Design a protein around this ligand. Structure first.
Ligand SMILES: O=c1nc[nH]c2c1ncn2[C@@H]1O[C@H]2COP(=O)(O)O[C@@H]3[C@H](O)[C@H](n4cnc5c(=O)nc[nH]c54)O[C@@H]3COP(=O)(O)O[C@@H]2[C@@H]1O
Ligand SMILES: O=c1nc[nH]c2c1ncn2[C@@H]1O[C@H]2COP(=O)(O)O[C@@H]3[C@H](O)[C@H](n4cnc5c(=O)nc[nH]c54)O[C@@H]3COP(=O)(O)O[C@@H]2[C@@H]1O
Ligand SMILES: [Ca+2]
Ligand SMILES: [Ca+2]
Ligand SMILES: [Ca+2]
Ligand SMILES: [Ca+2]
Lengths: 237, 237
């Protein structure tokens, strides 16, 4: 091992149908709640492996210590894809010691560099799948993560990038994109998740369109080393 | 200025509904028909502007020389910096001197790098549209160019990346992507173009799916300094 230290924040994912917590996304934070990028910008090429392992262990240990009983979603470091199909060992043992079933752990994948890897990320997604992990395509529709990923493999979940959601209630173009992507997701039996929801107007539009899993400041900011509670305003029913 | 020289190849775009030629895409070649990548890899940052200009004029002058009477589609260099809206003068002047109507010239845009200065490509696209040029999103559904582009601006055409077309007659995931993307394109009144069509089987499925404009080796490989004719096999089927 370790060169610098950091901890985790947690942001709830809500099932807007049932009003229950689907899970929490783990997000790296500095020890004084500094930004994730501030932490990751300290990550270089010799850091990729060890930082990735600390990330998984810190999130799992803190989720366990906090008593999380729903799912834990961890960001997969995108350039940690050096084909080491046994470096998942550190993860499985971390889950064992913390009595956290692998099936309650979801890994979020993003393409970060255009170099039509697919098979490279696909080998990982299907391998993680074979171990019992849940998987998600993250930032779908943010330029990098796109249809090319969905053509060669399908995850349990697709997190729609928040740029596509912003002000969707007033944006007929964004409205058409989402409707046809939801029909696509349903055709591929993939569960959608609307990310970055900021206002009642977005949430209300996303919910009528059929999105159940949602995430964003409207429900709760991330909580430093905590499991935030959810705004009761949406859950009025 | 320039340091090296090059010329153009041309590949027909067919409208399978009208069975007519839509136009040709210009594709860079070495002076002895070397590959586009071999030529383009010679471009650095002090080359970008002048090479981008040389490309446009050579395509317009040679299409004129060859007697091209349909549309001319020119690849917009993805790293064509923050060029002001007055470097378009060279383009307009070449079109005029060669009596090539501006409305018969289409520019193809790809995202490449930096995912969030999509407001910049929007300014360029809307500026070119205002002058009368046709515009297209190239490589749609591959690594870089995706839904984020369609969310903030709409071009005349979207060229669906050939990775999504390959084997589409037998690939239910790809069939699902295209089906839902065609309905999206139609909602945005965007004309789709299926790129890289290689077999009768692919062409037949895309055509039954409603695609009119297509491009690929099935119809004709690019012609060095020439305008290829198109395989009569599609004009029957
Ligand atoms: O309503 C909202 N309106 C606006 N913004 C909202 C709303 N709701 C949430 N957000 C925000 O969405 C981001 C998290 O989602 P994302 O994964 O797409 O972004 C990246 C990526 O994950 C990476 N990263 C982070 N941690 C790790 C890690 O442990 N291992 C590997 N990579 C890691 O750096 C993240 C950006 O840093 P963050 O600031 O920490 O988080 C933001 C913030 O919470
Ligand atoms: O059925 C098929 N099966 C298989 N392959 C098929 C089929 N049909 C077509 N092809 C191929 O598809 C590509 C053309 O389209 P694309 O734009 O996506 O490709 C890039 C890019 O645009 C850029 N480039 C090229 N010229 C310029 C330029 O003037 N200014 C700026 N950038 C320029 O380098 C191009 C690659 O060079 P190429 O090898 O010549 O072209 C290929 C080839 O012909
Ligand atoms: Ca994420
Ligand atoms: Ca995300
Ligand atoms: Ca092109
Ligand atoms: Ca292309």
């Amino acid at each position: 091992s370790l060169d610098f230290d950091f901890t985790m924040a947690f942001q709830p994912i809500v099932n807007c149908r049932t009003k229950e917590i689907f899970g929490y996304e783990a997000l790296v934070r500095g020890l004084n709640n500094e930004s994730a990028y501030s932490v990751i910008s300290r990550v270089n090429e010799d850091n990729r492996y060890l930082f990735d392992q600390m990330c998984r262990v810190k999130a799992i240990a803190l989720a366990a210590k906090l008593g999380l009983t729903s799912k834990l979603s961890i960001n997969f470091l995108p350039n940690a894809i050096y084909v080491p199909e046994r470096c998942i060992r550190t993860t499985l043992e971390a889950a064992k010691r913390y009595q956290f079933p692998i099936e309650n752990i979801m890994f979020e994948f993003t393409e970060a560099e255009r170099v039509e890897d697919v098979n490279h990320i696909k080998r990982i997604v299907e391998y993680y799948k074979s171990l019992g992990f849940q998987t998600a395509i993250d930032d779908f529709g943010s330029g990098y993560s796109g249809l090319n990923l969905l053509a060669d493999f399908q995850t349990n979940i697709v997190k729609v990038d928040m740029g596509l959601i912003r002000n969707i209630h007033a944006d007929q173009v964004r409205q058409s994109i989402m409707k046809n992507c939801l029909k696509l997701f349903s055709d591929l039996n993939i569960q959608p998740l609307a990310e970055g929801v900021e206002s009642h107007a977005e949430f209300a539009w996303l919910k009528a369109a059929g999105v159940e899993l949602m995430q964003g400041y409207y429900f709760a900011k991330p909580g430093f080393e905590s499991l935030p509670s959810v705004n009761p305003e949406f859950s009025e029913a």
